[PDB]
Amino acid sequence: SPLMGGFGLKHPPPQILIKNTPVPADPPTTFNQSKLNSFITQYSTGQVSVEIEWELQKENSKRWNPEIQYTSNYYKSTSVDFAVNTEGVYSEPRPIGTRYLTRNL
Amino acid sequence: GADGVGSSSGNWHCDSTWLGDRVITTSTRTWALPTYNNHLYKQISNGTSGGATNDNTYFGYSTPWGYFDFNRFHCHFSPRDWQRLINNNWGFRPKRLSFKLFNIQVKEVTQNEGTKTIANNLTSTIQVFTDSEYQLPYVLGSAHQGCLPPFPADVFMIPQYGYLTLNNGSQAVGRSSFYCLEYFPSQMLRTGNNFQFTYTFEDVPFHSSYAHSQSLDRLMNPLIDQYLYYLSRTQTTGGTANTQTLGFSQGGPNTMANQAKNWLPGPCYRQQRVSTTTGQNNNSNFAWTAGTKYHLNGRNSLANPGIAMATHKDDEERFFPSNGILIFGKQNAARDNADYSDVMLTSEEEIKTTNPVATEEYGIVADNLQRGNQQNTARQPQIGTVNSQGALPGMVWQNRDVYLQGPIWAKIPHTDGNFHPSPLMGGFGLKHPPPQILIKNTPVPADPPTTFNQSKLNSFITQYSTGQVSVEIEWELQKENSKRWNPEIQYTSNYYKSTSVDFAVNTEGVYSEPRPIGTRYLTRNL
Amino acid sequence: HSQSLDRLMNPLIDQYLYYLSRTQTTGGTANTQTLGFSQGGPNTMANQAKNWLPGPCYRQQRVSTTTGQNNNSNFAWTAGTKYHLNGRNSLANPGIAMATHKDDE
């Protein structure tokens, strides 16, 4: 199991490699064996969508008292947590783990 | 489907698939094609008036077309694939090929003042055709630059097609032919079209991807004597006055040079010996005056590399025939007068077993008729040295080795006869080789005048084309079935540490091949 | 044939193979041994690497139709091109197929 946390996979999601095909500038009119090192400056744009399906494991607990949950602070503040500020910069104010519900050993 | 400006007409396919006795190499590159000769055919020639010697005269034509050349082995095999081939197989040969030309992009260049603009010309075409009937002069098989690069990430420029015909000095004769390539059916492609064709190699013998573990003069049993006799003595011994006699012996283990044998080494065309230690060579410029040449129509041509002969004998790796080996250049070597450290000499020492050494004679023959002093004056047997020797019955020989950087095939000239038509530079001699693919940018005229003029248009739009080219060859393998006990010799990388990886790019992105790699590593019995 | 055997090349492109073009330095007053290699191109086509060789040879004696150019002796048989069989000399007539003369001769 990875030491940074997560799912250790023998065959993980394969890495997707992407590149702009080179487009040469005008070559000389006399033949030259050297490889072409003059190209047209270029870049690409587009959209990428990734969809993951996760499987859940629901809790079946007989604990009587209420659990600990992750919650937003009710108090007033200058900005909303996990939202953009006045300059349009999105930020995450804190790290959020996943261990809130409880179990017996 | 639906071909247009916005859809791709091919996919990048560079790979190799080993399956049984087959290996299928596919390769894709990116090319650029300029406009050659200003869309003109031009008569080219070279005479002795300029200052050239009669050996270098020619008459021919320079065409505006370009051609595709994948006639080297590194166009199809990676260095690791070449290692899988030569370490495990006794022979190989090509079976069929596929060729594709896709993702065409024709671009136009404008040059107002000192500004250069490159824009798409969506309606321009390129023309492509293959010489499937072998009706044009075949210029593949002359070891010319302009191949598909060995490194798949390199972009290459397509070479210009030209040809030669008969000449008398710088002039032509009545039999000199002129060919217009526009006089052929050609396919026109806009940015949404692609081109493709397939080809099947004829039956050609496998390349000998092995060395011999026996030599021709050592096929005997080293324990048993022969029942045949040989003349071992013509003069008595021991006494003070020796007289003539006849004495015969049986060839055995201790006299194996005298034994009767069934075969002879291959033919010879002796070369001059040059040492890589310069201090050992003669102090004169003898590369051409002492070269090994052939004579054709009063024109001397170097026999380069010539017939397949062993480069050197045992313990003499520093010697090579003056023009009897293939010599490749290291990455970024000069075109003229490159130093010895800038080139990579090949070596055919693996065929010492059947082929004579290139710098040695073939053998010894008699010159006169020996006689005694019975009547006329006594005459001692005279011998002569055989420096050239054509085919004799009972000869056996090997061809020249193929290399990763070397050529693959050549076209066998259409003649009345030939002897062992295997190309002297190494490879597969084909009566009908892969046809040459010709390519050109269709001319696009600039604005013509508004009043009619009969003159042909000589003002065009500056243009060039780009695209991808994929070639896939299927090779047939000949697996080794050996009962040798000890391990073979294999090609291997050096384990030691180094500044760069061999057959990889350096810090500047330049790919290079550090050495030539032959194919004779496994062994066989004669 | 409209081509010759030593002219099957492309007259515009250089060869990638090298040939030994120099065995002695030049320029100086005392020239020493060296090794120099060049690529065969359009201007040096006699040095280019080639795949084939001309046919076999069995050299004959040259006779001119201008009698004044020939030697003043009766050499039709003494200088003939012959083969030897069982101690009998036979003229090799006409012999193997060879070009009668070169250009302009």
XYZ file of C-alpha atoms in Angstrom:
736
model
C 0.000 0.000 0.000
C 1.610 3.293 -1.052
C 3.299 5.107 1.801
C 1.889 8.458 0.677
C -1.609 7.004 1.017
C -3.947 5.576 -1.567
C -4.449 2.419 -3.581
C -1.481 0.335 -4.651
C -2.159 -1.096 -8.099
C -0.186 -3.672 -10.057
C -1.617 -2.153 -13.248
C -2.651 1.428 -12.506
C -4.390 3.837 -14.865
C -1.989 4.050 -17.801
C -0.291 7.352 -18.400
C -1.672 9.309 -21.352
C 1.053 10.928 -23.439
C 0.332 13.916 -25.678
C 2.418 16.003 -28.073
C 2.081 18.531 -30.884
C 3.282 17.016 -34.137
C 6.209 19.118 -35.413
C 5.508 21.312 -38.427
C 8.688 22.350 -40.260
C 9.237 25.811 -41.629
C 10.184 26.197 -45.283
C 13.116 23.872 -46.039
C 15.916 24.941 -48.387
C 15.593 24.390 -52.113
C 18.821 22.347 -52.264
C 18.915 18.992 -50.513
C 20.601 18.736 -47.121
C 20.922 15.528 -45.121
C 20.820 17.295 -41.742
C 17.671 16.883 -39.707
C 15.303 19.825 -39.821
C 15.684 22.201 -36.875
C 13.454 25.072 -38.059
C 9.784 24.642 -37.196
C 6.563 26.610 -36.961
C 5.819 27.823 -33.443
C 2.682 26.089 -32.216
C 0.597 25.060 -29.237
C -2.662 23.209 -28.738
C -5.835 23.618 -26.673
C -8.830 21.452 -25.932
C -10.984 19.890 -23.270
C -10.373 16.746 -21.246
C -13.005 14.783 -19.355
C -12.320 11.961 -16.900
C -15.076 9.933 -15.249
C -14.368 7.543 -12.369
C -16.845 5.139 -10.792
C -16.222 4.488 -7.096
C -17.666 1.721 -4.930
C -18.945 2.625 -1.475
C -18.931 0.628 1.761
C -21.823 1.827 3.901
C -21.621 1.942 7.682
C -23.823 -0.364 9.765
C -23.264 0.869 13.304
C -25.188 0.371 16.536
C -23.515 3.303 18.268
C -26.022 5.313 20.282
C -24.411 8.742 20.609
C -23.835 10.966 17.558
C -20.712 10.576 15.440
C -18.058 13.139 14.614
C -18.670 14.725 11.211
C -16.850 17.140 8.966
C -18.672 20.461 8.996
C -18.308 24.043 7.863
C -17.959 26.701 10.533
C -21.242 28.531 11.045
C -19.595 31.773 12.156
C -19.327 34.813 9.911
C -16.185 35.292 7.835
C -14.700 37.418 5.072
C -14.830 34.615 2.495
C -16.468 31.250 2.019
C -14.170 28.280 2.539
C -13.477 26.355 -0.681
C -14.607 29.279 -2.836
C -13.033 32.050 -4.898
C -11.963 35.325 -3.307
C -12.497 38.830 -4.710
C -9.674 38.351 -7.245
C -11.052 35.069 -8.577
C -8.450 32.850 -6.900
C -9.819 29.513 -5.734
C -8.211 28.069 -2.631
C -8.510 25.140 -0.260
C -8.173 26.347 3.346
C -7.437 23.038 5.085
C -6.738 19.388 4.311
C -9.656 17.015 4.749
C -9.072 13.385 5.661
C -11.689 10.607 5.523
C -11.742 9.182 9.067
C -14.808 10.613 10.795
C -17.123 7.666 11.425
C -16.038 5.046 13.948
C -15.806 1.271 14.210
C -14.998 -1.344 16.803
C -11.715 -3.190 16.589
C -15.142 7.855 -44.713
C -15.185 11.659 -44.892
C -11.838 13.256 -45.751
C -11.382 16.974 -45.254
C -9.364 19.794 -43.762
C -10.317 19.007 -40.173
C -9.902 15.232 -40.063
C -6.669 13.270 -39.820
C -5.877 10.871 -42.654
C -3.500 8.568 -40.783
C -2.100 7.505 -37.440
C 1.466 7.303 -36.191
C 2.549 3.652 -36.308
C 6.132 2.873 -35.279
C 6.579 -0.590 -33.807
C 7.978 -4.089 -34.319
C 6.213 -7.425 -33.849
C 8.069 -10.725 -33.482
C 5.877 -13.765 -34.118
C 7.407 -17.136 -34.903
C 9.609 -17.040 -37.982
C 8.407 -13.522 -38.856
C 9.299 -10.045 -37.678
C 7.224 -7.078 -38.856
C 8.879 -3.675 -38.550
C 6.775 -0.560 -39.019
C 8.170 2.952 -39.014
C 6.736 6.460 -39.276
C 8.531 9.751 -39.870
C 7.737 13.385 -40.623
C 9.040 14.788 -43.900
C 9.313 18.150 -45.624
C 9.328 18.624 -49.396
C 10.564 21.846 -51.009
C 10.089 22.994 -54.573
C 13.042 21.652 -56.550
C 14.661 23.312 -59.569
C 11.942 26.003 -59.802
C 9.615 23.373 -61.319
C 12.120 22.883 -64.166
C 13.921 19.953 -65.718
C 17.565 20.840 -66.296
C 20.256 19.143 -68.348
C 23.344 18.583 -66.202
C 26.770 17.489 -67.382
C 30.438 17.493 -66.439
C 33.275 17.412 -68.942
C 37.051 17.691 -68.961
C 36.952 21.348 -70.040
C 35.983 22.410 -66.521
C 38.929 20.573 -64.995
C 37.450 17.178 -64.239
C 39.192 14.031 -65.401
C 37.670 11.706 -67.976
C 36.710 9.295 -65.177
C 34.179 11.725 -63.652
C 32.355 12.910 -66.784
C 28.581 12.588 -66.981
C 25.455 13.748 -68.773
C 22.033 13.648 -67.193
C 18.961 15.518 -66.065
C 17.918 17.178 -62.822
C 14.197 16.854 -62.246
C 11.836 18.866 -60.023
C 10.653 15.700 -58.261
C 11.678 14.129 -54.982
C 11.778 10.497 -53.950
C 11.437 8.399 -50.814
C 14.335 6.211 -49.688
C 14.036 3.616 -46.923
C 16.915 1.490 -48.258
C 18.924 1.300 -45.043
C 18.453 -1.154 -42.219
C 18.183 1.457 -39.464
C 15.118 2.875 -41.210
C 13.223 -0.187 -39.969
C 15.155 -1.737 -37.059
C 15.912 -0.120 -33.743
C 19.334 -0.942 -32.271
C 17.653 -3.297 -29.809
C 15.642 -4.942 -32.591
C 18.857 -5.419 -34.560
C 20.256 -7.153 -31.478
C 17.283 -9.508 -31.212
C 17.819 -10.337 -34.884
C 21.560 -10.987 -35.039
C 21.840 -12.835 -31.724
C 19.146 -15.441 -32.373
C 18.837 -16.030 -36.120
C 20.941 -17.701 -38.784
C 19.358 -15.728 -41.614
C 16.644 -13.323 -42.651
C 15.123 -11.816 -45.782
C 12.347 -9.363 -46.691
C 8.919 -10.641 -47.694
C 6.542 -7.728 -48.341
C 6.153 -4.031 -47.599
C 3.405 -1.460 -47.130
C 3.872 2.259 -47.732
C 1.626 5.112 -46.625
C 1.662 8.873 -47.139
C -0.805 10.801 -44.998
C -1.551 14.062 -43.167
C -0.508 16.194 -46.130
C -0.032 19.906 -45.417
C 0.830 22.250 -48.289
C 2.053 25.639 -47.106
C 2.760 28.868 -48.965
C 5.472 31.379 -48.068
C 5.175 35.106 -48.631
C 8.093 37.468 -48.252
C 7.109 41.118 -48.071
C 10.176 43.220 -47.122
C 12.112 41.452 -44.360
C 9.003 39.686 -43.102
C 8.369 35.979 -43.752
C 4.839 34.572 -43.379
C 3.890 30.900 -43.682
C 0.216 30.104 -44.188
C -1.758 27.048 -45.202
C -2.752 26.619 -48.839
C -5.748 24.345 -48.391
C -6.420 23.894 -52.118
C -2.890 23.019 -53.255
C -1.898 19.475 -54.171
C 1.110 17.201 -54.231
C 1.657 14.522 -56.859
C 2.764 10.994 -55.961
C 3.418 7.950 -58.128
C 5.452 4.752 -57.959
C 7.573 3.450 -60.839
C 5.980 0.014 -60.687
C 7.144 -0.875 -64.212
C 10.778 0.183 -63.650
C 10.646 2.585 -66.588
C 12.817 5.288 -65.020
C 16.500 5.113 -64.107
C 16.681 3.426 -60.716
C 18.757 5.562 -58.350
C 18.029 3.607 -55.194
C 20.779 1.150 -54.448
C 23.590 3.663 -54.921
C 23.954 4.363 -51.177
C 22.688 7.942 -51.303
C 21.783 10.223 -48.436
C 18.171 11.149 -47.819
C 16.933 8.046 -46.009
C 14.251 7.957 -43.383
C 16.206 8.883 -40.245
C 17.138 6.109 -37.805
C 15.692 8.053 -34.853
C 11.874 8.257 -35.124
C 11.788 11.784 -33.680
C 13.845 13.332 -36.486
C 12.254 15.319 -39.307
C 13.906 14.821 -42.673
C 14.049 16.556 -46.024
C 13.111 14.564 -49.118
C 15.990 14.309 -51.627
C 15.809 15.516 -55.210
C 15.468 13.000 -58.023
C 17.989 13.090 -60.852
C 19.360 10.564 -63.288
C 22.184 9.947 -65.726
C 22.305 8.582 -69.252
C 25.001 7.931 -71.841
C 27.661 10.574 -72.373
C 30.792 11.260 -74.408
C 32.577 13.793 -72.259
C 30.090 16.471 -71.240
C 28.057 15.773 -74.383
C 25.266 13.318 -75.092
C 24.885 10.711 -77.810
C 21.964 9.539 -79.923
C 21.074 6.812 -77.431
C 20.879 9.207 -74.480
C 17.354 9.103 -73.082
C 15.374 11.995 -71.643
C 12.552 11.210 -69.223
C 9.723 13.515 -68.190
C 8.118 12.310 -64.980
C 4.953 14.271 -65.732
C 4.529 11.759 -68.571
C 3.379 9.231 -65.943
C -0.027 8.770 -64.304
C 0.252 10.412 -60.900
C -2.106 10.791 -57.953
C -2.912 14.322 -56.791
C -3.488 14.859 -53.076
C -4.952 17.804 -51.240
C -4.621 18.247 -47.477
C -7.363 15.687 -46.863
C -6.132 12.845 -49.066
C -3.654 10.050 -48.427
C -1.607 7.660 -50.553
C -0.699 4.023 -50.073
C 0.638 0.998 -51.923
C 1.847 -2.515 -51.166
C 4.701 -4.548 -52.609
C 5.812 -8.176 -52.445
C 9.485 -9.115 -52.529
C 10.466 -11.906 -54.880
C 12.137 -15.049 -53.582
C 15.654 -14.051 -52.551
C 18.132 -16.218 -50.599
C 18.409 -15.603 -46.872
C 21.268 -13.431 -45.727
C 23.981 -15.464 -44.018
C 23.642 -14.126 -40.483
C 26.388 -16.339 -39.088
C 30.094 -17.044 -39.148
C 31.611 -20.410 -39.985
C 33.088 -22.382 -37.100
C 35.213 -24.435 -39.509
C 37.592 -23.324 -42.229
C 37.691 -24.766 -45.730
C 41.176 -26.262 -45.387
C 40.259 -27.976 -42.092
C 37.244 -30.155 -42.928
C 39.224 -33.359 -42.358
C 39.362 -35.872 -39.534
C 42.458 -34.946 -37.481
C 43.088 -38.544 -36.359
C 42.922 -40.648 -39.526
C 45.263 -40.683 -42.494
C 44.153 -40.364 -46.089
C 44.293 -43.320 -48.428
C 45.321 -41.039 -51.305
C 48.974 -40.283 -51.953
C 50.700 -37.054 -52.922
C 54.126 -36.387 -54.403
C 56.244 -35.594 -51.347
C 59.799 -35.850 -52.693
C 61.541 -35.328 -56.032
C 65.155 -35.670 -54.858
C 66.936 -38.202 -52.672
C 68.422 -37.088 -49.368
C 71.150 -38.134 -46.966
C 73.959 -38.710 -49.436
C 76.552 -36.241 -50.655
C 75.321 -36.102 -54.278
C 71.528 -36.119 -54.366
C 69.814 -37.451 -57.481
C 66.314 -37.279 -58.908
C 63.680 -39.613 -57.498
C 59.931 -39.891 -56.986
C 58.538 -40.257 -53.484
C 54.921 -40.374 -52.395
C 53.271 -40.038 -48.995
C 49.800 -40.185 -47.490
C 48.329 -36.993 -46.086
C 47.682 -37.224 -42.376
C 47.201 -35.132 -39.251
C 50.689 -33.619 -39.358
C 50.643 -32.715 -43.079
C 47.226 -31.180 -43.655
C 48.430 -28.658 -46.219
C 49.261 -31.566 -48.544
C 45.982 -33.455 -48.162
C 43.591 -33.943 -51.043
C 40.538 -31.702 -50.712
C 37.257 -31.257 -52.564
C 36.806 -27.475 -52.610
C 38.531 -24.156 -53.264
C 38.239 -20.677 -51.739
C 36.125 -18.056 -53.431
C 37.309 -15.663 -56.125
C 39.906 -12.950 -55.619
C 40.482 -9.406 -56.905
C 43.474 -8.249 -54.906
C 43.403 -4.889 -53.114
C 46.125 -2.720 -51.639
C 46.806 -3.028 -47.921
C 46.546 0.047 -45.693
C 47.358 0.167 -41.988
C 45.500 2.247 -39.430
C 48.908 2.960 -37.894
C 49.934 5.682 -40.342
C 53.645 5.258 -39.615
C 53.475 1.818 -41.234
C 52.016 3.063 -44.527
C 54.115 4.364 -47.394
C 54.833 8.096 -47.495
C 52.888 8.923 -50.641
C 49.337 9.712 -51.740
C 48.400 6.340 -53.234
C 44.661 6.224 -52.513
C 43.830 6.554 -56.220
C 47.043 5.723 -58.097
C 47.290 2.375 -56.293
C 43.555 1.768 -56.047
C 41.867 -1.378 -57.300
C 39.883 -0.312 -60.334
C 37.899 -1.603 -63.275
C 37.959 -0.242 -66.813
C 34.770 0.528 -68.737
C 34.605 2.505 -71.996
C 37.962 4.137 -71.363
C 36.822 5.251 -67.922
C 38.434 4.032 -64.708
C 36.155 3.263 -61.785
C 37.205 2.203 -58.321
C 36.151 -1.352 -57.462
C 34.565 -0.185 -54.231
C 34.036 -2.213 -52.173
C 34.357 -5.015 -54.710
C 33.854 -8.724 -54.305
C 33.466 -10.109 -50.801
C 36.908 -10.891 -49.402
C 38.199 -11.224 -45.860
C 39.433 -7.875 -44.580
C 42.551 -9.246 -42.875
C 44.022 -12.499 -41.632
C 44.611 -13.506 -38.014
C 46.244 -10.989 -35.676
C 46.153 -8.183 -38.267
C 43.071 -6.111 -37.448
C 45.018 -2.923 -38.230
C 45.062 -3.636 -41.988
C 42.224 -3.049 -44.436
C 41.919 -3.065 -48.232
C 42.357 0.450 -49.596
C 38.880 0.479 -51.161
C 37.516 -2.916 -50.193
C 35.358 -2.187 -47.136
C 32.261 -0.206 -46.292
C 33.179 2.939 -44.359
C 30.493 4.781 -42.403
C 30.914 8.236 -40.914
C 30.422 9.105 -37.276
C 27.815 11.682 -36.322
C 28.724 15.082 -37.777
C 31.777 14.068 -39.785
C 33.152 16.167 -42.608
C 32.167 15.425 -46.184
C 35.734 15.740 -47.488
C 38.992 14.632 -45.878
C 37.527 13.339 -42.634
C 40.094 12.029 -40.193
C 40.298 8.346 -39.313
C 38.776 9.025 -35.889
C 35.681 10.476 -37.605
C 34.788 7.338 -39.597
C 33.879 3.752 -38.717
C 35.575 1.047 -40.786
C 33.749 -2.242 -41.182
C 35.514 -5.602 -41.156
C 34.622 -8.838 -42.966
C 37.064 -11.026 -41.019
C 34.263 -13.545 -40.380
C 34.718 -14.951 -43.895
C 38.393 -15.883 -43.518
C 37.092 -19.447 -43.553
C 35.983 -19.600 -47.196
C 36.941 -16.268 -48.828
C 40.548 -15.223 -49.499
C 42.015 -12.232 -47.709
C 41.454 -9.040 -49.687
C 45.092 -7.911 -49.512
C 46.700 -11.309 -50.214
C 47.090 -13.346 -53.364
C 44.774 -16.200 -54.247
C 47.433 -18.858 -54.652
C 50.333 -20.134 -56.717
C 50.399 -21.624 -60.219
C 53.188 -22.853 -62.446
C 54.852 -20.668 -65.069
C 57.147 -22.975 -67.065
C 57.827 -26.663 -67.721
C 60.633 -27.864 -65.475
C 63.243 -30.202 -66.914
C 66.588 -31.704 -66.011
C 69.980 -31.643 -67.690
C 69.567 -34.724 -69.882
C 69.587 -32.948 -73.246
C 68.903 -29.227 -73.106
C 70.015 -26.895 -70.318
C 68.360 -27.646 -66.981
C 65.365 -25.502 -66.032
C 64.027 -24.969 -62.511
C 60.264 -24.933 -61.944
C 58.943 -21.376 -61.966
C 55.849 -20.246 -60.096
C 53.564 -17.277 -60.522
C 51.390 -15.409 -58.074
C 47.645 -15.293 -58.733
C 46.438 -11.822 -57.768
C 43.108 -12.043 -59.611
C 41.072 -15.230 -59.956
C 37.658 -15.706 -61.512
C 35.278 -18.535 -60.768
C 36.746 -22.046 -60.719
C 34.703 -25.252 -60.362
C 34.541 -26.284 -56.736
C 34.687 -22.750 -55.321
C 32.659 -21.725 -52.284
C 32.326 -18.254 -50.807
C 30.238 -16.018 -48.566
C 28.671 -12.678 -49.397
C 29.447 -9.390 -47.690
C 27.806 -8.733 -44.337
C 24.873 -6.351 -43.933
C 24.970 -3.645 -41.277
C 22.453 -1.639 -39.284
C 23.561 1.503 -41.137
C 24.006 -0.301 -44.446
C 21.838 -0.783 -47.519
C 19.146 -3.432 -47.813
C 18.617 -4.127 -51.505
C 19.702 -3.207 -55.004
C 18.238 -3.644 -58.453
C 19.890 -6.321 -60.577
C 20.714 -4.709 -63.939
C 18.617 -5.976 -66.832
C 21.314 -7.799 -68.798
C 21.749 -11.002 -70.774
C 23.857 -12.651 -68.089
C 25.159 -12.159 -64.591
C 27.267 -14.160 -62.165
C 26.003 -14.463 -58.573
C 23.915 -11.252 -58.674
C 24.313 -10.250 -55.054
C 25.062 -6.541 -54.584
C 28.697 -5.837 -53.828
C 27.781 -3.313 -51.132
C 25.856 -6.057 -49.336
C 22.179 -6.868 -49.299
C 19.560 -8.514 -51.470
C 19.810 -8.345 -55.238
C 16.320 -8.043 -56.694
C 15.205 -8.234 -60.310
C 12.184 -6.113 -59.354
C 13.039 -4.166 -56.205
C 10.731 -1.898 -54.227
C 9.676 0.704 -56.786
C 10.843 4.235 -56.231
C 8.142 6.596 -54.974
C 8.268 9.996 -56.656
C 6.733 13.074 -55.036
C 6.373 16.715 -56.066
C 4.476 19.881 -55.185
C 2.131 20.811 -58.006
C 3.136 24.269 -59.289
C 0.802 27.127 -58.407
C 1.248 30.148 -60.692
C 1.209 33.696 -59.443
C -1.170 36.171 -61.060
C -0.738 35.987 -64.848
C -0.906 39.125 -67.000
C -4.234 40.384 -68.273
C -3.088 40.246 -71.917
C -2.368 36.861 -73.453
C 1.237 35.716 -73.771
C 2.314 32.419 -75.306
C 5.406 32.080 -73.098
C 5.282 29.454 -70.394
C 4.582 30.770 -66.923
C 7.719 31.312 -64.840
C 6.207 33.153 -61.850
C 4.844 30.867 -59.146
C 3.753 30.911 -55.525
C 6.489 29.811 -53.137
C 5.416 26.570 -51.494
C 6.491 23.456 -49.644
C 4.732 20.430 -48.213
C 4.804 18.407 -44.987
C 3.314 15.133 -43.862
C 3.974 11.734 -42.382
C 5.239 8.596 -44.084
C 4.925 5.068 -42.739
C 6.655 1.995 -44.165
C 6.064 -1.517 -42.843
C 8.248 -4.456 -43.891
C 7.662 -8.103 -43.025
C 10.856 -10.144 -42.704
C 11.222 -13.925 -42.629
C 13.550 -15.454 -40.054
C 15.740 -18.556 -40.245
C 16.203 -19.894 -36.726
C 19.413 -21.567 -35.608
C 19.407 -25.271 -34.724
C 22.864 -25.819 -33.272
C 24.350 -28.583 -31.140
C 27.316 -26.481 -30.054
C 28.065 -26.975 -26.368
C 29.966 -23.834 -25.380
C 28.292 -20.401 -25.428
C 28.157 -18.359 -28.621
C 29.485 -14.881 -29.284
C 26.744 -12.263 -28.956
C 26.438 -8.556 -29.545
C 26.232 -6.789 -26.201
C 26.314 -3.340 -24.669
C 29.272 -2.462 -22.479
C 28.340 -2.685 -18.809
C 30.858 -0.055 -17.712
C 29.859 3.481 -16.787
C 29.962 6.177 -19.459
C 28.989 9.775 -20.140
C 26.191 8.831 -22.548
C 24.168 5.800 -23.524
C 25.154 4.234 -26.834
C 22.473 4.622 -29.518
C 20.771 7.440 -27.610
C 20.561 11.227 -27.748
C 23.167 13.407 -26.057
C 22.528 16.551 -23.998
C 21.872 18.604 -27.158
C 19.310 16.164 -28.544
C 21.570 14.736 -31.259
C 21.033 11.038 -31.896
C 24.095 9.091 -32.963
C 25.204 5.565 -33.759
C 28.589 4.871 -32.139
C 29.653 1.798 -34.122
C 28.576 -0.327 -37.077
C 26.834 -3.580 -36.228
C 27.072 -6.561 -38.554
C 24.932 -9.717 -38.352
C 27.465 -12.560 -38.051
C 27.549 -13.591 -34.395
C 26.157 -17.124 -34.274
C 28.202 -19.908 -35.850
C 27.689 -22.830 -38.211
C 29.644 -25.759 -39.557
C 30.813 -25.693 -43.144
C 21.489 0.217 -72.880
C 20.798 3.912 -72.364
C 22.749 3.884 -69.090
C 26.249 2.667 -68.336
C 27.189 0.504 -65.373
C 29.376 3.140 -63.705
C 26.629 5.787 -63.990
C 23.625 4.279 -62.189
C 23.814 6.872 -59.407
C 21.828 9.992 -58.609
C 23.927 12.914 -59.916
C 22.622 15.350 -57.277
C 22.954 13.531 -53.951
C 26.084 12.494 -52.100
C 26.731 9.013 -50.792
C 26.658 8.290 -47.090
C 29.546 5.831 -47.479
C 33.134 7.017 -47.232
C 36.195 6.081 -49.256
C 39.896 6.534 -48.562
C 40.727 9.755 -50.400
C 44.128 10.696 -48.960
C 47.122 8.863 -47.500
C 49.520 11.814 -47.209
C 49.149 15.323 -45.823
C 49.479 18.289 -48.159
C 50.379 21.960 -48.003
C 53.488 21.743 -45.857
C 57.080 21.337 -46.970
C 57.571 17.830 -45.512
C 54.446 15.747 -46.056
C 53.767 12.879 -43.662
C 51.501 9.850 -43.665
C 47.849 10.336 -42.769
C 44.420 8.829 -43.374
C 41.709 10.922 -44.992
C 38.220 9.876 -45.996
C 35.607 11.512 -48.208
C 32.059 10.877 -49.366
C 31.492 10.086 -53.025
C 29.371 12.690 -54.742
C 28.512 14.135 -58.141
C 32.034 15.394 -58.833
C 33.843 12.181 -57.798
C 31.822 9.388 -59.375
C 34.823 7.183 -60.094
C 35.337 6.823 -56.332
C 31.734 6.017 -55.417
C 30.721 2.681 -53.968
C 28.908 0.542 -56.536
C 27.097 -2.791 -56.532
C 28.191 -4.363 -59.826
C 31.158 -5.085 -62.080
C 31.633 -5.253 -65.858
C 31.563 -8.586 -67.613
C 34.548 -10.859 -68.163
C 37.543 -10.012 -70.326
C 39.898 -11.914 -72.647
C 42.021 -9.168 -74.143
C 42.527 -8.970 -77.913
C 45.026 -7.121 -80.064
C 43.974 -3.775 -81.509
C 44.039 -3.243 -85.277
C 43.265 0.015 -87.062
C 41.487 0.291 -90.391
C 43.974 3.052 -91.213
C 46.854 0.774 -92.191
C 49.483 3.460 -91.594
C 48.677 3.293 -87.880
C 49.269 -0.458 -87.569
C 52.668 -2.003 -86.951
C 54.735 -2.977 -89.990
C 54.702 -6.730 -89.469
C 52.497 -9.744 -90.172
C 51.028 -10.244 -86.697
C 47.586 -11.640 -87.542
C 48.516 -15.064 -86.144
C 51.624 -14.520 -84.007
C 49.820 -11.846 -81.976
C 46.385 -13.438 -82.166
C 44.282 -14.229 -79.122
C 44.264 -18.000 -78.868
C 43.307 -20.891 -76.637
C 45.304 -24.062 -76.067
C 43.723 -27.515 -76.292
C 45.657 -30.801 -76.420
C 48.818 -29.081 -77.599
C 46.909 -27.407 -80.417
C 46.487 -23.644 -80.686
C 43.120 -22.334 -81.816
C 42.191 -18.731 -82.434
C 39.606 -17.411 -79.970
C 37.433 -16.156 -82.801
C 35.386 -14.152 -82.152
C 35.603 -14.984 -78.456
C 33.601 -13.668 -75.552
C 31.335 -10.689 -76.138
C 33.333 -7.505 -75.606
C 32.852 -3.963 -76.847
C 34.643 -3.461 -80.151
C 36.022 -0.011 -79.314
C 35.498 2.849 -76.898
C 34.143 6.307 -77.709
C 35.523 8.125 -80.753
C 37.566 5.111 -81.908
